[PDB]
Amino acid sequence: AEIELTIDGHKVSIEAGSALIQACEKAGVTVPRYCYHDKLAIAGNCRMCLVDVERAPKPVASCAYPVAPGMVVRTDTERVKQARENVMEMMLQNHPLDCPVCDQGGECDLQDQSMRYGRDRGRFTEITGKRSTEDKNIGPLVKTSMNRCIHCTRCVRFANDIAGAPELGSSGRGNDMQIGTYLEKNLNTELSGNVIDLCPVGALTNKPY
Amino acid sequence: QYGGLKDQDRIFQNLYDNYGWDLASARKQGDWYKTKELILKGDTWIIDEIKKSGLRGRGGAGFPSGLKWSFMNPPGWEKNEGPRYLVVNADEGEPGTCKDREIMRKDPHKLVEGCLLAGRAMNATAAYIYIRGEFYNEAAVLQTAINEAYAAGLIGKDACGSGYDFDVYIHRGMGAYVCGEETSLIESLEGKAGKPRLKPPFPAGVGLFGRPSTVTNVETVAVAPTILRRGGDWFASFGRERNSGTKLFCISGNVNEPCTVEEEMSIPLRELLEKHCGGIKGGWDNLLGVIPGGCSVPILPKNICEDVLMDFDALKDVQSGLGTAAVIVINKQQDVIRAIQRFAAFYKHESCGQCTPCREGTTWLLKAMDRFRTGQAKEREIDMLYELTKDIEGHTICALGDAAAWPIQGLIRNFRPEMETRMKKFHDEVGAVSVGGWMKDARVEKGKVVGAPLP
Amino acid sequence: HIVSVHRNTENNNPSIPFEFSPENMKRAEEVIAKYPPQYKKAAVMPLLDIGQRQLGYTSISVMNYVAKLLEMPPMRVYEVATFYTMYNRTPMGRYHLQICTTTPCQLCGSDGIMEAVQNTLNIKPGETTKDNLFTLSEVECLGACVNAPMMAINDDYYEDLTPEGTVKLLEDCKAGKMPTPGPENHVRRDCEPASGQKVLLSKEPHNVADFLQEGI
Amino acid sequence: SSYPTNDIAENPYWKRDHRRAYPQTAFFDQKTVTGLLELGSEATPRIADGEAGTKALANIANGGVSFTQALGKSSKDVIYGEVLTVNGLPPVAPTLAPKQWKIIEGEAAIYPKGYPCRTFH
Amino acid sequence: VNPADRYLQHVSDLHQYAKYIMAALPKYIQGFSVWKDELTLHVAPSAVIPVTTFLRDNTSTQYKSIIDITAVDYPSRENRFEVVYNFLSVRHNSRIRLKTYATEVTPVPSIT
Amino acid sequence: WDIVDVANRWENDLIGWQSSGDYMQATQMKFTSKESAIKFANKQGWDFYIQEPHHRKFRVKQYANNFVHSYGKLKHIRTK
Amino acid sequence: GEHALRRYPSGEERCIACKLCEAICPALAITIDAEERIDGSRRTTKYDIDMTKCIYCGYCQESCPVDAIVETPNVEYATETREELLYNKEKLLANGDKWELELQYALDADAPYR
Amino acid sequence: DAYDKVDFDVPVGMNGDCYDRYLIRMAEFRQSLRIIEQCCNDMPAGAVKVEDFKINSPPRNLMKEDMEALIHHFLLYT
């Protein structure tokens, strides 16, 4: 049955066991996100969706935190604003300066959430520069620019769970973790083009377009 | 006064391979003597004894062992049909620490017995002992002992005729520090890459193979049968309140004689050093710092260890921790900045890469520490580096990120003037530096950066 | 770094057939038996290891064989194999030198050990020897911090090292023999202070049975 | 650039985000001002606690008291403190920065005495 | 520094002033709004002549200069058009705004 | 406005720009409600069509569901 | 003054068809078409400026991330027919080639201030 | 903007005719010259646009080096 909690002072009633980001969406509160998507399994790897919960001592991932009766949630605290800036700072430090040549430009959630929740200027001026990534060929439909990848794993979750195409995955570890097929394989599925919509950034784009 | 451990009060008697690890030798030690009666006693009694013991987690976090074990027994647990699992964490991996390797090599039968007893206390159907892959010979020793225990009906269908079934298996890790994290450990057991899960769900609810599981350190499990035999009050008699019992204290670094030994909690650091390790190389005057516990904890300056007790409470009050009780001393001849840079490199290498704050922040921390090592940085950047650690701390899926943030913070707090001196040395020596380590002659040429050192 | 792309060579190529030897097979059956029947994909890490024992390294052919044997998609096995550093995805030599360079080893001369090894074998820490006999590696903590400057040879630890001692160790390696299974020139029995035991100086250990809880 | 805006180590953007700390436009219809007259204000209350205050707020928020009955009921103290000034006078149309004019005459003037153009400072 | 802060006391003054006006012409003033230094009165069209007369001729207001009149189209409202008047008092160095509404067929009283 | 076939867009023969004869082609009105929009359209004598919006159906999502124990053969390997 | 499209010292065009100039243009004077070049580069296939719509505000030159579209100091390009004032890409590239040296003086003097 | 920081006088007529207005404009010439001189003497150092890149575009050397600056520039111009 539905339980009841409060978000930013408002009262919201939601089915028991639903994720906190679902209750936030129901109560009309906007929460930034990258890896969460309504049609994919919850991942919780981007860390953009942090909120404060009075029982929780540190901010929690909204997308993966189950709601409980009497929960009190604040999406607007100074700690939450600080965390959003911190996460965006870490996300942009290796992201390539590609917006003029990137097809995502102008309809990009990274651009928009940088504008809405991030710092106005960066602090990263390291002389060893940024990480670069090899590009990967997965057929004539989906062009890849993998410097842009922010490792949200939406493409992998869609390709595995929804389309049933397990050739896609993440190889390596740490800074060198790469989305791909680990060897030259097409992303072979009649549903493949959907990953272009799912990729929040210009990492996977429409090649004919 | 705290710390005099007497040999009769010693738990891990084969620590120096003075009595053997054969099952007969462990029998001489008394292992497997009352195991029938310990099983026959109610799980409630084992849990309540472990609670009365004061034992707390030995993998580095020091949660109450009894309560953590109790969580696998909710009121209606039996109604959830299926296997229940005990997982034993022997991933070591924390640089500085060697205790579990000694426990696996010298007293394996004690570990096997601890798995049986804990599994009873948790109503577990089977155990899995997760072992780091570089401990190949340790794995061979532990297997051999487990085969012995299987042979003698100590571990199997009717564990000493208990009517309680237990199976014990070894699973080997293959080179990942993060797999010491309990949820990463479970994911690696299941046949995936060792990326940790978010909590909730907690392992007691949903764990290994989606079943109720509990992940525990090998020293908290290995001491358990001795604890049960000798009584909770006795184990409580050693160490102060809430830090009670006796821990292994591996000591490494710049001491005259490195060692591995067991001692009462709440022992002074000065006394521990002087009496076990022959003391700091050069004398207490020649001590820069000590890291109490492995690389993940903030380093102690010279004048706090003169008064500090090897507990959780005392170390936390001075803003560090016990961790795995892996002491590392650094004398005045070594560079603390180089050591912290090496720790930053370790954390950059051991990040699983799942979550952005860790996956990117560890790399940024390594770049900054490479520049601070040579002095190619501006002084205000120290403050920026401090703020950088706060980007990672408290924002990550698992606690590797907090571990990566902490040593830097200890370094800044305790040795800022060291870094300022190195910066002066660079500025006089090489030239004037901009933020990020740029200098007036540095620019991009035909694919590279030229005009600058490039740390 | 970590190499996370495979490129087909003639020696590392999917077409190359890899089958387990019968003894390795029977072992693989036994290893699979330890996990629930539905969750036998949880044997991928041991099975891959067995493959890397039979053949020199974890090749793509081995990855695909293990993937077929556990009915997994090969990308799941690729993820596992590239995640864990103890899987060697490039072929190596007979002797794998692994120098721990983490801070406890560094504070005690791991840099000197590295210089000795690099001088004897000109190769860099990632490179393998021209005669395909030695392969170096810098590594993180191996769990032997008491044994201050330690090292690994293919499976075995060698501790309390010295530059000249390491030259002699590499020489004995290169001739074919093995000087000592023991970790070092016998200065200690693997964990005690160099001045000898300060505790546990009793000829026989105290049985725990003289202390019992009065409630058994 | 200016300090502290250019600092690399102590300025979160949200502490100087003045666009997002913009003042809300305050709208007052006659029901709200009725409530201000009857119940007093957050600054100086004239409300009872418990259910009494919430029910008073509700019944003004529903239409029970009109603005004109509100004004007639209002006492001398309310009318003088909170509608007029403490002296009973109306408030004057307010000015943000009052300007005191002065007339410059003599040699410092722009034109001499004859011209029909004076100098105001 | 937040630029809005310098207005705070003035904002209070405007509130007080608006209260007086609404208490003096409760037949006419539907409402008022206050943003930093701008005070708006909201009235029905039939209220325009009296209120304007008041604003022009009362001793505490004295809004002698008409600055502008315009309309704003709000197609969602039943009355499309809001008519906006801005007035200046050189006597008191003060500005004020007055709003009413209209449609494509219902006129407003001219203030010529 | 719906497009008119003849007047919508054609290629200019001089420079290649897109010409148009439909003066409404770029106009879009915004309304705060469907009812306000219908009222305005009726008041202007405009023939209209209402396209009712579609919304995402709600379902319960749980992170823990990624790890539920399987009693029989796994239907797929979840990877994360 | 009159617009030009610039090159890199190699001779490659600087414009990569981001279309920021087209978006910012207050007079909607710029019309752009692009696709992938046979070598894989992102490049324009059409770049038009209606000089009789342009207001010579310089916003395109401010917006460009690669200094591709610029205004020269040239004012002496009056024409006898209006058709001559619809600049296509060839005309603009030729203007860049023609005026590059004066453009370099202007950039060397004002680049630090942008 | 800075009119509170400079010193100038205001000319006022009395006849409300074209000649008074001419005299006013001629005096305003002089007062503007006064203010221009004060600005030439008191021009301070620092930025000339608001230092928030969500409002005004960042400088070009940041735009071509820093990721946040490039994003903000792209968004402000599109």
Ligand SMILES: Cc1cc2nc3c(=O)[nH]c(=O)nc-3n(C[C@H](O)[C@H](O)[C@H](O)COP(=O)(O)O)c2cc1C
């Ligand atoms: C990066 C990381 C590595 C860890 N490695 C180990 C380990 O090697 N051995 C261990 O016992 N606990 C390790 N832990 C902590 C355990 O996951 C867990 O918190 C607990 O300490 C184990 O059970 P315990 O209460 O008996 O100590 C690690 C934690 C983190 C965040």
Ligand code: SF4
């Ligand atoms: S993905 Fe977004 S932020 Fe990254 S280059 Fe493309 S448009 Fe810019």
Ligand code: SF4
């Ligand atoms: S390619 Fe796109 S969808 Fe896939 S992980 Fe990277 S950012 Fe996410």
Ligand code: SF4
């Ligand atoms: S904190 Fe680091 S190790 Fe832990 S889950 Fe995140 S990326 Fe992986």
Ligand code: SF4
């Ligand atoms: S100068 Fe201004 S009007 Fe002319 S093309 Fe450039 S942006 Fe458009």
Ligand code: SF4
């Ligand atoms: S001229 Fe510059 S701004 Fe215009 S499309 Fe080309 S690169 Fe983009």
Ligand code: FES
């Ligand atoms: S959306 Fe919640 S962590 Fe990514």
Ligand code: FES
């Ligand atoms: S640092 Fe070398 S084994 Fe621990």
